[PDB]
Design a binder for this molecule. Structure first.
Ligand SMILES: CNC(=O)c1cccc2cc[nH]c12
Ligand SMILES: [Zn+2]
Length: 140
């Protein structure tokens, strides 16, 4: 589990969004596994605006923050999960590291801020849904 809190937006894994998130929906893309909802209170997080390929991610299933190299966001074939059938996931970044389904929402950060959240995993890879292309998160 986990979320990004930037301005009056909450960024969550689409598959973990709550009734409240859907009632207060701003934007969602099933192909990216992202949903953004509106918040009353201001968040503290800064989104990275960069093409960094090194960062650190939180892995709840290890209670550990791991430094990783990761690929640039791309379209990747993702095997079926409990929430999605096997399909191509867009804006996805891969790193060699430990992920379990419950690790989704773990933040990947670089020197510039939040890069994305854990979305996919298994086979010793972790997949992060990029948010850095979502420029509108920084305003309104
Ligand atoms: C929607 N798919 C998931 O819940 C998922 C997310 C992160 C890691 C793994 C490993 C297998 N499935 C995973
Ligand atoms: Zn960066």
């Amino acid at each position: 589990s986990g979320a990004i809190y930037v301005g009056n937006y909450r960024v969550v894994n689409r598959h973990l969004a709550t009734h409240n998130d859907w009632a207060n929906l701003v934007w969602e893309d099933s192909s990216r596994d992202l949903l953004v909802s509106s918040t009353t209170a201001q968040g503290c997080d800064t989104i990275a605006r960069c093409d960094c390929q090194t960062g650190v991610y939180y892995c709840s299933s290890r209670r550990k923050h791991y430094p990783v190299s990761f690929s640039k966001p791309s379209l990747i074939f993702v095997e079926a999960s409990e929430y999605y059938p096997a399909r191509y996931q867009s804006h996805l970044m891969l790193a060699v590291g430990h992920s379990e389904p419950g690790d989704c929402g773990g933040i990947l950060r670089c020197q510039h801020g939040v890069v994305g959240i854990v979305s996919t995993g298994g086979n010793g890879l972790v997949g992060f849904a990029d948010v850095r292309d979502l420029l509108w998160l920084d305003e309104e």
